[PDB]
Design an enzyme around this catalytic site. Structure first.
Site, PDB file in Angstrom:
ATOM      1  N   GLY A  14       0.785  -1.216   0.000  1.00  0.00           N
ATOM      2  CA  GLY A  14       0.000   0.000   0.000  1.00  0.00           C
ATOM      3  C   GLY A  14       0.821   1.273   0.000  1.00  0.00           C
ATOM      4  O   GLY A  14       0.267   2.319  -0.223  1.00  0.00           O
ATOM      5  N   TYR A  67      -9.629   0.160  -3.124  1.00  0.00           N
ATOM      6  CA  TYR A  67     -10.615   0.393  -2.084  1.00  0.00           C
ATOM      7  C   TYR A  67     -11.995   0.324  -2.691  1.00  0.00           C
ATOM      8  O   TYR A  67     -12.301   1.124  -3.571  1.00  0.00           O
ATOM      9  CB  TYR A  67     -10.429   1.769  -1.452  1.00  0.00           C
ATOM     10  CG  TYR A  67      -9.179   1.906  -0.678  1.00  0.00           C
ATOM     11  CD1 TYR A  67      -7.966   2.136  -1.321  1.00  0.00           C
ATOM     12  CD2 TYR A  67      -9.194   1.836   0.729  1.00  0.00           C
ATOM     13  CE1 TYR A  67      -6.799   2.275  -0.589  1.00  0.00           C
ATOM     14  CE2 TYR A  67      -8.038   1.978   1.462  1.00  0.00           C
ATOM     15  CZ  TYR A  67      -6.841   2.187   0.800  1.00  0.00           C
ATOM     16  OH  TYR A  67      -5.689   2.339   1.515  1.00  0.00           O
ATOM     17  N   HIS A 121      -6.052  11.661   9.065  1.00  0.00           N
ATOM     18  CA  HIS A 121      -4.682  11.173   9.057  1.00  0.00           C
ATOM     19  C   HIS A 121      -3.796  11.920   8.074  1.00  0.00           C
ATOM     20  O   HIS A 121      -4.278  12.581   7.153  1.00  0.00           O
ATOM     21  CB  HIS A 121      -4.610   9.700   8.685  1.00  0.00           C
ATOM     22  CG  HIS A 121      -5.001   9.415   7.269  1.00  0.00           C
ATOM     23  ND1 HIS A 121      -6.316   9.349   6.855  1.00  0.00           N
ATOM     24  CD2 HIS A 121      -4.245   9.165   6.166  1.00  0.00           C
ATOM     25  CE1 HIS A 121      -6.341   9.071   5.557  1.00  0.00           C
ATOM     26  NE2 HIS A 121      -5.100   8.954   5.117  1.00  0.00           N
ATOM     27  N   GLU A 149      -0.177  10.593   5.836  1.00  0.00           N
ATOM     28  CA  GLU A 149       0.296   9.344   5.304  1.00  0.00           C
ATOM     29  C   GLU A 149       1.390   8.834   6.168  1.00  0.00           C
ATOM     30  O   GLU A 149       1.947   9.545   7.007  1.00  0.00           O
ATOM     31  CB  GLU A 149       0.841   9.557   3.885  1.00  0.00           C
ATOM     32  CG  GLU A 149      -0.226  10.052   2.937  1.00  0.00           C
ATOM     33  CD  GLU A 149      -1.420   9.117   2.811  1.00  0.00           C
ATOM     34  OE1 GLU A 149      -1.221   7.985   2.263  1.00  0.00           O
ATOM     35  OE2 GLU A 149      -2.545   9.511   3.235  1.00  0.00           O
ATOM     36  N   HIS A 190      -6.055  14.575   6.140  1.00  0.00           N
ATOM     37  CA  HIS A 190      -7.267  14.409   5.395  1.00  0.00           C
ATOM     38  C   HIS A 190      -8.226  13.349   5.950  1.00  0.00           C
ATOM     39  O   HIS A 190      -7.824  12.466   6.669  1.00  0.00           O
ATOM     40  CB  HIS A 190      -6.937  14.139   3.949  1.00  0.00           C
ATOM     41  CG  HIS A 190      -6.015  12.978   3.727  1.00  0.00           C
ATOM     42  ND1 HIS A 190      -4.656  13.097   3.817  1.00  0.00           N
ATOM     43  CD2 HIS A 190      -6.250  11.691   3.372  1.00  0.00           C
ATOM     44  CE1 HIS A 190      -4.080  11.941   3.535  1.00  0.00           C
ATOM     45  NE2 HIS A 190      -5.028  11.070   3.250  1.00  0.00           N
ATOM     46  N   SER A 195      -4.748   3.544  -4.923  1.00  0.00           N
ATOM     47  CA  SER A 195      -3.862   4.507  -4.265  1.00  0.00           C
ATOM     48  C   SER A 195      -2.529   3.913  -3.908  1.00  0.00           C
ATOM     49  O   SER A 195      -2.396   2.710  -3.823  1.00  0.00           O
ATOM     50  CB  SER A 195      -4.538   5.121  -3.014  1.00  0.00           C
ATOM     51  OG  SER A 195      -4.230   4.418  -1.807  1.00  0.00           O
TER      52      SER A 195
HETATM   53  O1  LIG Z   1     -10.078   4.953   1.826  1.00  0.00           O
HETATM   54  C1  LIG Z   1      -9.804   6.071   1.355  1.00  0.00           C
HETATM   55  O2  LIG Z   1     -10.599   6.562   0.530  1.00  0.00           O
HETATM   56  C2  LIG Z   1      -8.609   6.721   1.701  1.00  0.00           C
HETATM   57  C3  LIG Z   1      -8.403   8.009   1.286  1.00  0.00           C
HETATM   58  C4  LIG Z   1      -7.278   8.713   1.644  1.00  0.00           C
HETATM   59  N1  LIG Z   1      -6.365   8.192   2.385  1.00  0.00           N
HETATM   60  C5  LIG Z   1      -6.540   6.894   2.928  1.00  0.00           C
HETATM   61  N2  LIG Z   1      -5.491   6.360   3.540  1.00  0.00           N
HETATM   62  N3  LIG Z   1      -4.241   6.855   3.242  1.00  0.00           N
HETATM   63  C6  LIG Z   1      -3.371   6.092   3.878  1.00  0.00           C
HETATM   64  C7  LIG Z   1      -4.040   5.127   4.559  1.00  0.00           C
HETATM   65  C8  LIG Z   1      -5.345   5.287   4.353  1.00  0.00           C
HETATM   66  C9  LIG Z   1      -6.315   4.484   4.870  1.00  0.00           C
HETATM   67  C10 LIG Z   1      -6.362   3.106   4.594  1.00  0.00           C
HETATM   68  C11 LIG Z   1      -7.371   2.247   5.081  1.00  0.00           C
HETATM   69  C12 LIG Z   1      -8.368   2.789   5.865  1.00  0.00           C
HETATM   70  C13 LIG Z   1      -8.320   4.154   6.136  1.00  0.00           C
HETATM   71  O3  LIG Z   1      -9.280   4.657   6.917  1.00  0.00           O
HETATM   72  C14 LIG Z   1      -7.339   5.003   5.637  1.00  0.00           C
HETATM   73  C15 LIG Z   1      -7.644   6.147   2.504  1.00  0.00           C
HETATM   74 NI    NI Z   2      -4.510   8.942   3.115  1.00  0.00          NI
END
Ligand SMILES: O=C(O)c1ccnc(-n2nccc2-c2cccc(O)c2)c1
Ligand code: NI
Ligand SMILES: [Zn+2]
Length: 345
Positions: free
Chosen positions: A164, A171, A182, A184, A270, A282
């Protein structure tokens, strides 16, 4: 709050501008995009990472997670229940069913209200963190699977695969599925492409205000903050736009529609939610600007760490002794674009 330097920009590159990924990122930073923490890039009309998405109903989502949310007054905690495996077909059935489908709405702001009013009820399932890619092998522009940034040093010099981060994740969304607040891992950049289906909405806090968001959350989750010095990295904390307005956190919102890329910048907080059944792809990437964010990243102290040695030796050999000894204390100015952007002025 209102300052357009910190507002999310949208970009419409031509096919020629598009072909070079690292250069276009440098361009959008030359234009201030990074100050918002999130930018949108619409690709040229002609470009298409796959012929079509009719042929993926048998794709296996190994570890779907049900997203249970608890809280009130716009503060919430998101817990995961791993469900046993299911296919894209089984997933779409649930998502497009009448128990889980997108409610009635006239405009974004109505759907937002329903999200914040109903996220604790009727727990959706997110097909998250699926290893894979939906680009065809032949796509050379903006190919999430192989972006040719300096992040490639982790695999090339260190010999390390991180799923990832170094590799793409898919997703599969459904109405009301969420990603909590969060940045990254190691405060990398990210790229997110919506392949098809309903949209994804995003909130963003500018990197220059991220510490404000951390102090809000420390204050609202004192237990969590004592246990771990980066508990946001757990990705369990949801905070509503109304709470942010109320405590003076500047933020912006934007909606990603099928066929669009979102870029997140180092230290760009974000969060967001999917409007209905959709699929996104992603990964993380880096520029030379990222290196300082990597050195300084505050990491989860209670359970991904990338070794920076390779980066400092390659890109900052002068500073290496000093850095190893603990003496390097460059301060980050979040406003400055990456060195690579000097060619645009
Ligand atoms: O799931 C998304 O749409 C998304 C969007 C933007 N960033 C995330 N990120 N980025 C790194 C890790 C995640 C993540 C990955 C899995 C679940 C989650 O809630 C967040 C995930
Ligand atoms: Ni993210
Ligand atoms: Zn932790």
């Amino acid at each position: 709050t209102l300052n357009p330097s910190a507002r999310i920009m949208t970009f419409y590159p031509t096919m020629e501008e598009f072909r070079n990924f690292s250069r276009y990122i440098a361009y959008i930073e030359s234009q201030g995009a990074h100050r918002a923490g999130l930018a949108k890039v619409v690709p040229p009309k002609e470009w298409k990472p796959r012929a079509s998405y009719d042929d993926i109903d048998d794709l296996v989502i190994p570890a779907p997670i049900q997203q249970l949310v608890t809280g009130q007054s716009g503060l919430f905690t998101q817990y995961n229940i791993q469900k046993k495996a299911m296919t894209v077909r089984e997933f779409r059935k649930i998502a497009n069913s009448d128990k889980y489908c997108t409610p009635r709405y006239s405009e974004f702001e109505e759907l937002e209200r329903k999200y914040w009013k109903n996220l604790t009820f009727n727990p959706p399932i997110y097909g998250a963190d699926v290893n894979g890619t939906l680009y065809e092998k032949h796509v050379d522009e903006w190919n999430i699977g192989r972006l040719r940034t300096i992040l490639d040093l982790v695999e090339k010099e260190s010999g390390i695969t991180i799923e990832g981060v170094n590799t793409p994740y898919l997703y599969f969304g459904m109405w009301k599925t969420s990603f909590a607040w969060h940045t990254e891992d190691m405060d990398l950049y990210s790229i997110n492409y919506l392949h098809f289906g309903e949209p994804k909405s995003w909130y963003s806090v500018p990197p220059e205000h991220g510490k404000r968001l951390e102090r809000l959350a420390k204050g609202f989750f004192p237990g969590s903050a004592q246990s771990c010095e980066a508990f946001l990295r757990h990705k369990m904390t949801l905070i509503s736009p109304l709470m942010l307005k109320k405590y003076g956190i500047p933020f912006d919102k934007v909606t990603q529609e099928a066929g669009e890329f979102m870029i997140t910048f180092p230290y760009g907080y974000h969060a967001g939610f999917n409007h209905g059944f959709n699929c996104a792809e992603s990964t993380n990437f880096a520029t030379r600007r990222w290196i300082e964010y990597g050195k300084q990243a505050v990491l989860c102290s209670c359970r991904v760490k990338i070794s920076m040695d390779v980066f400092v030796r390659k890109f900052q050999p002068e500073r290496y002794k000093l850095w190893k000894a603990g003496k390097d204390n460059t301060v980050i100015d979040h406003t400055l674009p990456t060195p690579e952007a000097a060619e645009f002025l």
